[PDB]
Amino acid sequence: PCCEVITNVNLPDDNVQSTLSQIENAISDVMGKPLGYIMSNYDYQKNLRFGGSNEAYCFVRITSIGGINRSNNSALADQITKLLVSNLNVKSRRIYVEFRD
């Protein structure tokens, strides 16, 4: 699967790499998928806005094949949100996680 983090939070490369790594480990864990199938990215979009505001915000897009489990999907979004909250300085309310296939 694929996890694209689209955010206006400027994070240094090491913090980006470790964050994506923890996220991959959660995907692997929750979804039962070896790390060899997993793509991730942190796409820094300084002009990104939500709610009429350019304050820190993360849009997380998770693409799998996929579209199979709700409790896995719900638990994954929860882990990723928690991971992002913990690494980024972003309010939980300013993270949106979307699933697709």
UniProtKB/TrEMBL annotation:
InterPro entries: Macrophage_inhib_fac, Tautomerase/MIF_sf
Single GO term (MF): cytokine activity
E.C. number(s) listed in UniProt: 5.3.2.1, 5.3.3.12
EC class of the enzyme, as a word: isomerase
GO terms for cellular component: cytoplasm; extracellular space; host cell cytoplasm; Maurer's cleft
The entry's keywords: Cytokine, Isomerase, Secreted
A Pfam family hit: MIF
Chief location of this protein within or outside the cell: secreted
Localisation: Secreted
Catalytic activity from the UniProt record: 3-phenylpyruvate = enol-phenylpyruvate; L-dopachrome = 5,6-dihydroxyindole-2-carboxylate
Annotated GO biological process: adhesion of symbiont to host cell surface via host glycoprotein; symbiont-mediated evasion of host immune response; symbiont-mediated suppression of host toll-like receptor signaling pathway
UniProt keyword annotation of Ubl conjugation present: no
Protein family per UniProt: Belongs to the MIF family.
Stated name of the protein: L-dopachrome isomerase
Top-level taxonomy: Eukaryota, Sar, Alveolata, Apicomplexa, Aconoidasida
